[PDB]
Amino acid sequence: QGPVCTNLGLKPGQRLTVKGIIAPNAKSFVMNLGKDSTHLGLHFNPRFDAHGDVNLIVCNSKKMEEWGTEQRETVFPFQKGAPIEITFSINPSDLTVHLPGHQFSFPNRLGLSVFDYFDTHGDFTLRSVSWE
Amino acid sequence: QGPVCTNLGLKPGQRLTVKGIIAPNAKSFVMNLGKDSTHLGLHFNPRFDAHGDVNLIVCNSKKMEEWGTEQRETVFPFQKGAPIEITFSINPSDLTVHLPGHQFSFPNRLGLSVFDYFDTHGDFTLRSVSWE
Q1: A vs B: CB pairs below 8 A
Q2: Which end of chain A is more exposed for a tag (fewer CB within 10 A), N or C?
């Protein structure tokens, strides 16, 4: 139930920037990054209120329909009804998430080299996907 | 084979901007826009040298695995190896292809209201998809 872009064709070293608006009464949204729908390096799920979590980010990886080990982040810079811009980066070392004033990290489990897949759903309205 | 984006979710009046680079030795490339992969409001195919055509654009529409009436327009503002930006709009009457220096029109055959689907392949490298 959301935007899905396959075979983006990023090159090594290129970072994926995503822009959109968080819904007025957002409960949560997710952004999935990886090689394809069944090989997600980063599952980025900010939750304002969902599954018992309040204002925290749930990050994870997904391989062949099986979730990896969850990691929560309580630094929650997201506001409802607000416009956000997030740039994702990747290297053999790990994945980086950069937001104005914050920078998160996540191990590069799947050993991906670039982001070729990106989808999103939830209380977020996508408005831009660009890379360089 | 190339980038495919589904369910972009554009609202009435929003224009889709596409950015990328035309290959240095490009023969041709295509951009398909519509509701989904089987309901293409506009099949945009610039041809430098392909299938007998030289320096011209072929446009068409598609419905259930079957192309509409092909149309060829001869004003060719593209250059090989050049970065380009194209913005597509759609209204009840026609669809608009905005290039720097030229604006093209194509009939709104399927009566679509917005662009929810976009894909591309050929001698063009996508680097950005945004709307507003």
Answers
A1: 52
A2: N
